[PDB]
Write a protein that binds this ligand. Structure first.
Ligand SMILES: Nc1ncnc2c1ncn2[C@@H]1O[C@H](COP(=O)(O)OP(=O)(O)NP(=O)(O)O)[C@@H](O)[C@H]1O
Ligand SMILES: Nc1ncnc2c1ncn2[C@@H]1O[C@H](COP(=O)(O)OP(=O)(O)NP(=O)(O)O)[C@@H](O)[C@H]1O
Ligand SMILES: CC(=O)OCC(=O)Nc1ccc(CC(=O)N2CCN(c3ccc(Cl)nn3)CC2)cc1
Ligand SMILES: CC(=O)OCC(=O)Nc1ccc(CC(=O)N2CCN(c3ccc(Cl)nn3)CC2)cc1
Ligand SMILES: [Cl-]
Ligand SMILES: [Cl-]
Ligand SMILES: [Mg+2]
Ligand SMILES: [Mg+2]
Lengths: 352, 352
């Protein structure tokens, strides 16, 4: 069977596909035509239908997995379009994780003789993260941070070594947020979560601005000024509040200036998009900091797809975590941040 | 001079006024006419101008303060209307706290010979809270909780004793949120804060629903269904997620269902108001729980005016704190929750 790992989230389905490249002359004859058309279709296209996308830049090449060499591909599409995916299949062992592995279990079994193996979301995320970092990103670091995140004339992306990754606080920003504490390869726990995640950003931004996509929401936010909607410390005090170490630029009340009708009438869509992004991102960073202090962990890695093509939130997290922790916490990021559950699911295949 | 304590916040000015009731025959003759008209005007009216309100139900009667007996009155008005207040004064020692004590310092000194004494916000809140609880609410408890907050057929308001109030986690919900740890009468600290507070609720609700007042926002929210906007755990999994103790009704992504255009077109204003209230309140409770765990404090008291005439948020905080802490944290509330800074400022008067 084709080796696939699937993570069916509330918003996106993430798929990891291992394409063998050591196909002998005999193995190619023994392969069925449906298998050849599948492998050709996946490798000959970067867009699948109207909503499927292969993230070509993330591909791992010449990976040795399960005793074979191949390429590891990373594919995503909206969970809303899973019926189309299943219908394409109806006309194999599937290791699946995420909430949709349970919700859509009966749907996957409409594909005759298909064996669906639901795998623990926490196990898949941790095993997938540790595996990708162990094999590296084609010889480059999988993990990176923003060095000197306080000075913008110096803030630049730099590699970070996770060869001894324990302990680790994993902040998974999907539709919501889950916070995980990883103490060893076999000792990890879900600490807590918050409901203010990527779905909040996208849903609120759509209500406030009328944007029609995650990308359009980010483009609006890049042009906006969140201080037009937010009430800052200096709006309340007239300046910094030194007694409690609060700079004048710190947000005292997100959207707090929107209690005034005249300010609601002058704010732009871009301003509101930026204020939504800043509000959600700062809240995520603050919860991550509080959890790191309680878990006594100083390395905080952020995953999920809320940070995909989202350098604003990445740099805001790097700056905020460093600033508010007085330099005691480090914000870490991962190139394959959206796909670790799908990889971890694929890695559960030998158990069946 | 008239004995006043003032807390000038980003949204509301809170005023505590001590009305002496042991005025002798001689003292009444010696009083100036402007003083008599002030005392009569404050005690003969419950509405001052178009935006000032005296919370008559909070009045403390026959209080002995600074060697005199009197009544302690509690008055509020929007900070936006402070210029009108100052202009009424221009046609005394003022102990003032809050951010506006700094921002509007020069404005108060336009009142000739008026001495403004800015007092620390943390000192005023703690001293005011401990004082009011010490003198009781006219013989009734100042502090209360919601007993059996898990069962709605049993959840009822019940008094709580704070005669030995240490340690105490104070969660001050104004425009934003400040979290304080009180270890003794002279040992207390600001732990942290969050920018998702009452100003976020009011500002977002006004943007999303067009409501024109805090009261109208609460009335809309009482009629709404937050699950029309929020994505729940059961929306993602099809039910409860027992592996991590997450019930199906828990919110996985606030406003997360608003990523779908068809759901944005069917949601009502009341639903969005309720989702705003639930989102802000749950985030406040979660941050309070995390801070309580780190500070090793099990009594969490909520103050500010976000909870004024807001039983929904109070009961949500009581239920959530008890449920998510497995019964190890207790949500506490105070009748004079919006006025402790103003009282603490009034109590600083003998120092001048
Ligand atoms: N093309 C996209 N479409 C939708 N959302 C996107 C897209 N790209 C990035 N995002 C963001 O990524 C978030 C979803 O991240 P993701 O890690 O895939 O979560 P999920 O698994 O689908 N949901 P969950 O069930 O909570 O794990 C969305 O809420 C958006 O903020
Ligand atoms: N009549 C009202 N007008 C405005 N807001 C109200 C009113 N009644 C209750 N509120 C709520 O109370 C919150 C303000 O609470 P409050 O404790 O008075 O804060 P503040 O001191 O004015 N702001 P801060 O500078 O952050 O301390 C508002 O954000 C509303 O959510
Ligand atoms: C392994 C993995 O990634 O799983 C995926 C995942 O976790 N999805 C998910 C994300 C977020 C949530 C929300 C949440 O966790 N909670 C718990 C804590 N809450 C409160 C509320 C009030 C108080 Cl006073 N205290 N706590 C808020 C709701 C639920 C599921
Ligand atoms: C005594 C009293 O009541 O004073 C009144 C008061 O406090 N007003 C007030 C309320 C709230 C605030 C906001 C805030 O405190 N912060 C600090 C923590 N932040 C972050 C962000 C990211 C990360 Cl990664 N970490 N931390 C967010 C901003 C500021 C003032
Ligand atoms: Cl299974
Ligand atoms: Cl002073
Ligand atoms: Mg996910
Ligand atoms: Mg205040």
């Amino acid at each position: 069977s084709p080796w696939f790992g699937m993570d069916i989230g509330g918003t996106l389905v993430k798929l990891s596909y291992f394409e063998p490249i050591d196909i002998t002359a005999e193995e190619e004859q023994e392969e069925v035509e449906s298998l050849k058309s599948i492998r050709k279709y996946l490798t000959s296209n970067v867009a699948y239908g109207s909503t499927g996308i292969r993230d070509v830049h993330l591909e791992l090449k010449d990976l040795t997995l399960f005793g074979r060499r191949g390429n590891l591909h990373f594919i995503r599409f909206p969970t809303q379009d899973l019926p189309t995916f299943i219908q394409m299949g109806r006309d194999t062992v599937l290791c699946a994780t995420g909430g949709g592995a349970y919700k859509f279990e009966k749907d996957f079994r409409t594909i005759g003789n298909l064996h669906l193996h639901k795998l623990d979301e926490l196990d898949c995320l941790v095993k997938g993260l540790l595996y990708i970092d162990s094999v590296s990103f084609n010889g480059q670091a999988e993990c990176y941070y923003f060095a000197n995140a306080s000075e913008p004339e110096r803030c630049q992306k730099m590699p970070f070594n996770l060869d001894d990754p324990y302990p680790l606080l994993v902040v998974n920003i999907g539709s919501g947020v889950s916070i995980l504490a990883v103490h060893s390869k076999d000792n990890y726990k879900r600490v807590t979560g918050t409901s203010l995640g990527g779905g909040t950003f996208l849903g609120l931004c759509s209500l406030l601005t009328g944007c029609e996509s995650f990308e359009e929401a980010l483009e609006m936010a890049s042009k906006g000024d969140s201080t037009q909607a937010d009430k800052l410390v200096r709006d309340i005090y007239g300046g910094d509040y030194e007694r409690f170490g609060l700079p004048g630029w710190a947000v005292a009340s997100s959207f707090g200036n929107m209690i005034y009708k005249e300010k609601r009438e002058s704010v732009s869509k871009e301003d509101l998009a930026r204020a939504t992004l800043v509000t959600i991102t700062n809240n995520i960073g603050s919860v991550a900091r509080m959890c790191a202090v309680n878990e006594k962990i100083n390395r905080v890695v952020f995953v999920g797809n809320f940070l995909r093509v989202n350098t604003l939130s990445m740099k805001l997290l790097a700056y905020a975590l460093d600033y508010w922790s007085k330099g005691q916490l480090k914000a870490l990021f991962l190139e394959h941040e959206g796909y670790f559950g799908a990889v971890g699911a694929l890695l559960g295949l030998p158990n069946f």
